Amino acid sequence: NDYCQHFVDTGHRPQNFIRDVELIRLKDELIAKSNTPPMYLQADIEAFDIRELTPKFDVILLEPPLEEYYRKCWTWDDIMKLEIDEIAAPRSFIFLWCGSGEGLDLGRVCLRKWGYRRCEDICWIKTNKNNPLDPKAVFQRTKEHCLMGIKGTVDIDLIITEEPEIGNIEKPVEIFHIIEHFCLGRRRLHLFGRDSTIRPGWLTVGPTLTNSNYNAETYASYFSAPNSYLTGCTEEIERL
């Protein structure tokens, strides 16, 4: 009945007991067909003029390495000074991983600073089925937030997975499925991605990448006419 009391008694988080955590295959397949080749660039983002990332992006996924993930780190001071508005398309979206502490407030300041308004709060809820603490915390923190913002004019706002091993900072790959299922456009940027997050249909930029293949001219050539306004969910436009 009362999973809160049960957690106090046994250490099993209430989310451990959520159960069950059609033609979507075709959609997934069309997304795969219109995906650009993976592109990636090693860049030390604090020292790197982000304006050289072109063209302007339809989707930005921002995953700064917060100090709270470890228990080089980026403070919200650092993050807030990123020039995200300079590379976002006039109509575009952002997904910003905010953690579970002050980022929930400071990430909203960022979004507004960069011209976005929040349209969704996506919660990554962490179960502890296999293994049943900020001074300001009132409660044990068992989830993280990814804020979705929009500028200009099937899935649920919950991701439930088991808490990863200590020292593992990866976010659930399910966030990419949610993003790509929105069909927001094909210019997709993942800032602070890693070798392990490189993915078709995305440009990944981060300090720990071991290799790069990014070329602005080659990258822009994927979105030249007739393919400038595709959503990433439609059939490709035929040639010769």
Partner: protein, 197 residues
Amino acid sequence: LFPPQWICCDIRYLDVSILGKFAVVMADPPWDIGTLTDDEMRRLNIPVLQDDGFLFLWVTGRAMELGRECLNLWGYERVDEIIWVKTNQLQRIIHWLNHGKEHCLVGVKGNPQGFNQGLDCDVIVAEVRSTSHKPDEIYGMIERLSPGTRKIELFGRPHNVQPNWITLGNQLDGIHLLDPDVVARFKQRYPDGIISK
């Protein structure tokens, strides 16, 4: 004085100074997303209700941002955020995305001492009942956090009244007060038993 107490009122106009100080405030306001305007929410006399303690503030939609504003304007710092995952009786979850959850901001004011922080986690999993009816689990979380203390709920309905809580709301049935200090201040302020203006 320990058993449930409540006051049917318009929370905009009640002189909440007569109620004293509380270790915990909880509110489920009718955000303008019968509503209260943003300015009416901002003007609510929350600051007089506590010196040191915690505020629990349910939010949704643009109130996720407006509620942070009110919280800060009222003198709180947001230190936590509870997520209620909504399920049917079989523990299955019920614009761009379909919503499986509701949010409750946790603000702190002053320096609360002797609370049992960290006993519960920040996720609630509980069955949906009537509309806008929040889960009863929150009362047990709040009781474990701050046992035996005075607590006050704003915009509560009859099913919200609980021991150690005073409930305010315009769909409650009359006035039911037992704490003699509160009874005395209420009679002093409202001798004829009416709360207008």
